[PDB]
Amino acid sequence: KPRIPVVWIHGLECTCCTESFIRSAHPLAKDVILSLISLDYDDTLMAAAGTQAEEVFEDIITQYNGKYILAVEGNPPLGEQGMFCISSGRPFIEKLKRAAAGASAIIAWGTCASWGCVQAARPNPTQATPIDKVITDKPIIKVPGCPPIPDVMSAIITYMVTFDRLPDVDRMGRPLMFYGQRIHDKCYRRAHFDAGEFVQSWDDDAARKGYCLYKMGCKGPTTYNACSSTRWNDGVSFPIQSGHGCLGCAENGFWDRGSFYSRV
Amino acid sequence: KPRIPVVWIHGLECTCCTESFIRSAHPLAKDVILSLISLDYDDTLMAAAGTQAEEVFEDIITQYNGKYILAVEGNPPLGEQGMFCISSGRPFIEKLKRAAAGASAIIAWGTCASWGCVQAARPNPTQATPIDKVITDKPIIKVPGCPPIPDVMSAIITYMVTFDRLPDVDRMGRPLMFYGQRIHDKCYRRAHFDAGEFVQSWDDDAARKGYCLYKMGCKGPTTYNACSSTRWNDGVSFPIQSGHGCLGCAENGFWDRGSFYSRV
Amino acid sequence: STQYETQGYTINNAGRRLVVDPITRIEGHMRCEVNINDQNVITNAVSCGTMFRGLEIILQGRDPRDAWAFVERICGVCTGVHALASVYAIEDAIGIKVPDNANIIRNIMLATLWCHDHLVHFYQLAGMDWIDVLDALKADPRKTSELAQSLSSWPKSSPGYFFDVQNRLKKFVEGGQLGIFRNGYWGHPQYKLPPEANLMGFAHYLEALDFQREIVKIHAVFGGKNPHPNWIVGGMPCAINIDESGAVGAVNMERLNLVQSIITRTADFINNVMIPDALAIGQFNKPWSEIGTGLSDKCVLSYGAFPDIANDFGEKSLLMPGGAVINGDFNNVLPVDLVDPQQVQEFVDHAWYRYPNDQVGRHPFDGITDPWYNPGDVKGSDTNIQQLNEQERYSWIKAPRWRGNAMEVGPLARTLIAYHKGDAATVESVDRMMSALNLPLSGIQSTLGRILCRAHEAQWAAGKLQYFFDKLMTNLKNGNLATASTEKWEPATWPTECRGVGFTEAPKGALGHWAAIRDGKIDLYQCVVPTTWNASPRDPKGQIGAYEAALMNTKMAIPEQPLEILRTLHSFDPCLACSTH
Amino acid sequence: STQYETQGYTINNAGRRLVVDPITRIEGHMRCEVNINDQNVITNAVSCGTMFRGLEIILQGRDPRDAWAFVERICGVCTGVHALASVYAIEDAIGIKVPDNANIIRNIMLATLWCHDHLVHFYQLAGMDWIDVLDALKADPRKTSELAQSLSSWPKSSPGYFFDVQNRLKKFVEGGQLGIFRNGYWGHPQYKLPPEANLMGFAHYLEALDFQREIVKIHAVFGGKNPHPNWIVGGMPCAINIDESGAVGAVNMERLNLVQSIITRTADFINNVMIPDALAIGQFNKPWSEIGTGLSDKCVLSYGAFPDIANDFGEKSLLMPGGAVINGDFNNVLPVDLVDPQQVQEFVDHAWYRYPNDQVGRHPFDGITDPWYNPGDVKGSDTNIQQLNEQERYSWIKAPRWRGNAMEVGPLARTLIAYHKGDAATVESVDRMMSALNLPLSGIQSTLGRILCRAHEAQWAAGKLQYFFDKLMTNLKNGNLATASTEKWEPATWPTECRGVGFTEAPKGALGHWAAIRDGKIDLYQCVVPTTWNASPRDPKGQIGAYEAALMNTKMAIPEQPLEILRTLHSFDPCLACSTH
């Protein structure tokens, strides 16, 4: 039986969300690509380049008009007439608009596509702009994080294939399943927060006992994600477990909320 | 280069600690057996039986007198002159004392060897007795839990091999590395405990959001172990993560502290 | 010395007495004694459970909701099966019906345990009876690769792989620290595999030791941990949340994806490693299709298991058939009723227990567990058993009978019941398996048959895991998330007095828990466990149990080296902690 | 049209223009244009970075302690290396020395990233230039098994395995949904592997896609997550506790055990899968030892990496050597000083930036990042480019030079520097590799050589992972646990004005971050990244960068199918987000 067409495009980005996706432990990204979806365009992985890649893009968005999922990594820059990000000699934004017009639904992978991420941090030299300020007539599912958790990305994809519908979202368009609760509301160091048991300098005795990272700038109290529950890299760790406070990397504007080491 | 000799004996037990040991993810139990120790006696896994197994036991404790680690799973019963547990026609306690006399140190695996576990629960029909009430002249490391965590078992073995010393222990003989803190002091549901957000009946809306299990009888607040941090089965879960309160299974006398569903 | 006739056997305790104590590569504590005649053939066999803990006594006075957690600790090998039987028994007593997802998840827990228990038993417990590990050092790695590739599509077959495994074994042995291989039976004439098959089997022993840890990740997802996962009366505690806020605190799509990944890998390992190895052991050891028949051509018992209709324990629901055969009449598979006082009864005239009348058998609702260590004259002392006295009390295991008949339980028993009830999948699988070996159907009623049936069951259970997972996902697609019924959670809702039976097919065979509740507490809790049947001592008629029968009439090549005794006992997967509880 | 001479090339833009935009199977955005003569030979090559974000502008005014987290997001492929260069730069500026275990763990993070990046590049990015995936459907599974087993001890080689892989590919393409294989170059005459080697390589593509996720578990232990782990100025935040209360809150023996398990598996995969596949691509594609030389026989550059003596960045400390070769004189490996204003400079006369004088180069402590999109007289228009004008500004990539010379960086560059400095392990490895191919040492200075060196480096880094792990455990055995220096953590402890250089060898080559701190804030932060060097546009002398030079003089079989262009560009592992930052 045919697999759901997916077109994956890349604006200004660092490719972390693509790398996250391929870390998926269950299902393996191999099995997502071979058996669950038809990944029909993706600059990172596809054989074709140049005019052969342009032909794939055109062929898929034409033949599967109205029927493909558009995955977007990164964002369009409005500066220099969009030519801070060029594809096939034209502004990236034109490729984003063409791909968006034929899509059934749009997944905004990562904080870049969702909100702006590092290139939109002050002073935003390129005028990098999240997808939902350019595409205003299509369902957009925001999957924020820098990058989002590998097994969250694959679980969102399996949900859509298995249940044949988009995940239910909060008022910001984030899937309730993984973004409904704050990091701090499922943090294994919360006992120490509640007791006033804090790391005060790196590698102090508190740090060596896994005390709370609030006074070291942890932004877990204002960050919605699944890092303290689902965790990272097949459950191996997450930022706080390995001794660094949450940066707040799933939240809009997290680069410009003051130092990562200044308290929430 | 010779590997440290280990003699593993079994009193009254269910064999859960042996099963837990073979679950080890890192190092694999295979590599512990082939590369890290010489597992020279173990009724569950050894080729020899009967007189051939008695020959191995006698040869190893004689040849390596003073130089082997004795691992003990289960416990001796003092009832019926010890014949609630019979080894080569004689009370198990006799084999325990012979093995203990030649050991450099003893690992008491599990709540059975450490404290008593289920056979010692009221009314203790066999007079099941923990190892440290019988063997009083040897170092005994208690590794409690029903069973202890697989990767905790293998980490204690690798510590002893790598560092050539016993783990440092608390006042009850438990390794500080894995038993120094309570389950409730590293529990990812502690935010809900602090907020008064409790499961009140199974599968209620609170249970479906991962609220705290205190009112369902969780004994995390009085239990020392690594289940809420290291977790179980290669980090996949632990009791509370899958929706059941801690039973208290690492603590002495946990079967007789009231109903598992009565509050701490 | 004496002689008497029972069940077609001549029980004769003349001749040399051999003692095997301890039995190793089992769970828990067992002693076996035999007598052999001048042709080194067993004419008497004595099965002895050498441990007791008293869970039936400890359960008195507990809260019925807690019982599962206590009785789970009957055994860490068949971990979970006693918890399942317990929640079934308490739900049967009170009158609780669980939601469909709880039933499906319980079936997943049980199928997971079947896969894990059968695989570890094949390799780590029984395998070294069939594979001469030290002989693997003589194998040619290229011929090993060729053999493996002829039997399976399994990827891991390169000559360099088999050379690396062989070299690891060589370096292990070279310093004389042979560990679990020390003082083994290596080179015994009953080891019949060629060196290449020994090296293939040894490589797979190591692969299975690694892989088995992954299977129980399913128990960790739904049950928190393995060994000894968690359960509740009323369903399971693993609340589901797929598409709502807080799914991070519940069984969500990521958790289910983990379960699916394990199922696939579990089927792949069993189908391409364990199944071909079982058929290879059969190909090289065909004479063992005629050894250790015991009661398997006389009397076999299954209660049945895996209710596919939630809260329906009837024949149309159970995916694993129940029934009994006696007197070798496989054309009349009889129905089993665990409430009927004339069906399951336990005797103690040859066991270390007190009854008011030791000449009668007690149904478990009339059960008594009053320990009485009384070995009589054992040619030593009460604390030095040199020879058990099988004319009197000789075991901590009670003697279960069905309508007075001594029965075999377990994979071979279940396979014969399903085959003779005309289960299509079973008939086709068994006929194809025995055809592949160029053996008659009767060859399954043997020590080799017990091993082949266990491998067949691991494959069946790996298939059923996917079936159950798909059933769960269908319910979630339809918005049916419920995992617990709590209408009768509170003791004020229970009957003042009630009783119930929980039953299933554990990996070793028919399991039952009989519970009576009074005034909110356990008044009586009696367990009859598969190894209790199989390892049973004698009854007032002198009838012998499954192990004693299977050992009768067996030739031993070398009396002092009990390889043939170990092969047959290990073929039943003895679980002595289960048997005694 | 114009023609000029530079570096032994005739740059001629007469004749047919070919455009490749987008370049795929890279990170980020690249455009390439070439001119080809009547003989289908490239006479002109144009490297264009088609993205910019401006991290150097964004970092102004930030707290130096935060800088690593911003610049880490230069790239998610080489994730971590910019964080490492950043903490090195800030520590160099302020005068911070980290504890030994922090340095060892940073070396582990870098070695982990080398293994991961090199493996994924080999299979997922470059592999399909060499392996004809659709030709794998014609292979014989038994001949594929025989080939794989002739090359490697790797276990996963059974005929059934290769059949199963082949059938998965056959099923994938059967619905006409070819996904990433659609409209590829399959059947191009430059595909030289036989069908069995295609199927072997395709099977390994899938094994590598699965296995790469495990490598980065080492990043998750020490750095919390991958991609984009966490770091600190002063060391690492992953406090260690082996034997004290609360070790469950720190890097403990169980966490170190997980790291060791990953190291062994990573070495085994690289040594037995990637290494033999790289040699097989060499054996079937020997002509590519003479194609794509570019600058690799003229000018190569390494800064060096992996300081083994904590806080010592000198030649006696760095385990991966530094040095520069110019003028093709490999007898004169020159020392590199990243503070010397006459050594590293960047030019922008051919890039989209403003300088006060675009005819001179600026050392990064004098760097300027003032973006100016001015493509001038293109064919087309400024928002619809048909042809860049390479006689004016044509890229978002600045043009770095070393003492005015255009240099190649990356695995081939490092291999040549280490070989010609007499590093014993490098000389042995390279000699054994080129002996196995029957090729002269000059064969490494090529497109094929860049791939062979990358595979050699993955093996080197997997070995170093064990070395560093063992050093860490030696410190812990000695009671040396420290992972952070905090005496200069607070801004009031810093110099009011200071500057520093942080440098390393990222997987793609020489990386530097130049930072100036004033009044507690970043005053200047300039990055020069390895793909900045390799993908560089021209300078005021018209000197071409490594990509443009490696493309010069390349024959194309089919002008409309850029397979040869992709082979040579992919051999450098282009990271365009890195190049532009």
Ligand code: SF4
């Ligand atoms: S470490 Fe961060 S998320 Fe966790 S309890 Fe402390 S402040 Fe909250």
Ligand code: SF4
């Ligand atoms: S679930 Fe148990 S251990 Fe966790 S916070 Fe609640 S009471 Fe404490």
Ligand code: FCO
């Ligand atoms: N299987 C199993 Fe254990 C036994 N006998 C139980 O029940």
Ligand code: FCO
């Ligand atoms: N490696 C890598 Fe990325 C590039 N170029 C960096 O630094």
Ligand code: SF3
């Ligand atoms: Fe995966 S591209 Fe990486 S920067 Fe923060 S989300 Fe963006």
Ligand code: SF3
């Ligand atoms: Fe591992 S034997 Fe299992 S009962 Fe509680 S520890 Fe005991």
Ligand code: F3S
């Ligand atoms: S920094 Fe990001 S990865 Fe999770 S812990 Fe905080 S949201």
Ligand code: F3S
């Ligand atoms: S029941 Fe035991 S396994 Fe851990 S969570 Fe509680 S100590």
Ligand SMILES: [Cl-]
């Ligand atoms: Cl794109």
Ligand SMILES: [Cl-]
């Ligand atoms: Cl943002």
Ligand SMILES: [Cl-]
């Ligand atoms: Cl023992």
Ligand SMILES: [Cl-]
């Ligand atoms: Cl206890």
Ligand SMILES: [Li+]
């Ligand atoms: Li320094």
Ligand SMILES: [Mg+2]
């Ligand atoms: Mg009983």
Ligand SMILES: [Mg+2]
């Ligand atoms: Mg720069």
Ligand code: NI
């Ligand atoms: Ni059991």
